[PDB]
Amino acid sequence: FLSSEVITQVRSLLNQGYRIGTEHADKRRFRTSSWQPCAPIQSTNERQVLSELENCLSEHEGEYVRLLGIDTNTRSRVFEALIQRPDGS
């Protein structure tokens, strides 16, 4: 289901030792950059992370979903990218 590009980004982050997070916003909240998190992904197992990521995406179909890479020691964000949009504009 997940794209090659999203799998590549996730592997890259995990391989570097970062945690993966995700958040979502409908079209109205996207306007004000008002995101809500999906459930935390504690696993560092690639199969599990991708599985949970796909659940976030499918639970929020028709919303924006943003992939995050998080330095666990700092809790600082090191990476962000949109991985799902509403495919109209």
Curated annotation (Swiss-Prot):
TM region(s), chain numbering: none
Disulfide topology: 38-56
Induction and repression of expression: Carboxysome size and components vary with growth conditions. When grown in ambient air at medium light (50 uE meter(-2) second(-1)) there are 719 units (both forms are included in this measure) of this protein per carboxysome, the numbers decrease under low light and high CO(2), and increase under high light (at protein level).
Statement on biotechnological application from the UniProt entry: Heterologous expression of 12 carboxysomal genes in E.coli (ccaA, ccmK2, ccmK3, ccmK4, ccmL, ccmM, ccmN, ccmO, ccmP, rbcL, rbcS, rbcX) leads to the formation of bodies that resemble carboxysomes, have densely packed paracrystalline arrays and RuBisCO activity. These structures open the door to generating carboxysomes in plant cells to increase their photosynthesis and productivity, as well as tailoring bacterial microcompartments to specific metabolic needs and molecule delivery.
Effect of inactivating the gene: Single gene deletion does not form normal carboxysomes, and does not grow in normal air but in 2% CO(2), called a high-CO(2) requiring phenotype, HCR. CcmK2 and RuBisCO are targeted to an abnormal large polar body in some studies, RuBisCO is soluble in others. When ccmL-ccmM-ccmN-ccmO are deleted no carboxysomes form, cells are HCR and RuBisCO is soluble.
Protein modification: Protease inhibitors do not alter the appearance of M35. In isolated carboxysomes M35 is 4-5 fold more abundant.
Subcellular location: Carboxysome
Family: Belongs to the gamma-class carbonic anhydrase family.
UniProt note: domains: In the N-terminus has a gamma-class carbonic anhydrase-like domain (CA), while the C-terminus has 3 repeats that are similar to the small subunit of RuBisCO (rbcS), called SSUL. The SSUL are connected by flexible linkers. The N-terminal domain forms a scaffold on which CA and maybe other carboxysomal proteins assemble, while the C-terminus binds RuBisCO. At least 2 SSUL domains are required for initiation of carboxysome assembly. Isolated reduced and oxidized CcmM35 binds holo-RuBisCO (RbcL(8)-RbcS(8)) but neither subunit octamer alone; RuBisCO has a higher affinity for reduced M35.
Role: Functions as a scaffold protein for the assembly of beta-carboxysomes, initiates carboxysome assembly by coalescing RuBisCO (ribulose bisphosphate carboxylase, rbcL-rbcS). Produced as a full-length (M58) and a shorter form (M35); both forms are required for correct carboxysome assembly and growth. The short form is more abundant. Despite its strong similarity to gamma-class carbonic anhydrase (CA) it does not have detectable CA activity.
Protein's name in the database: Carboxysome assembly protein CcmM
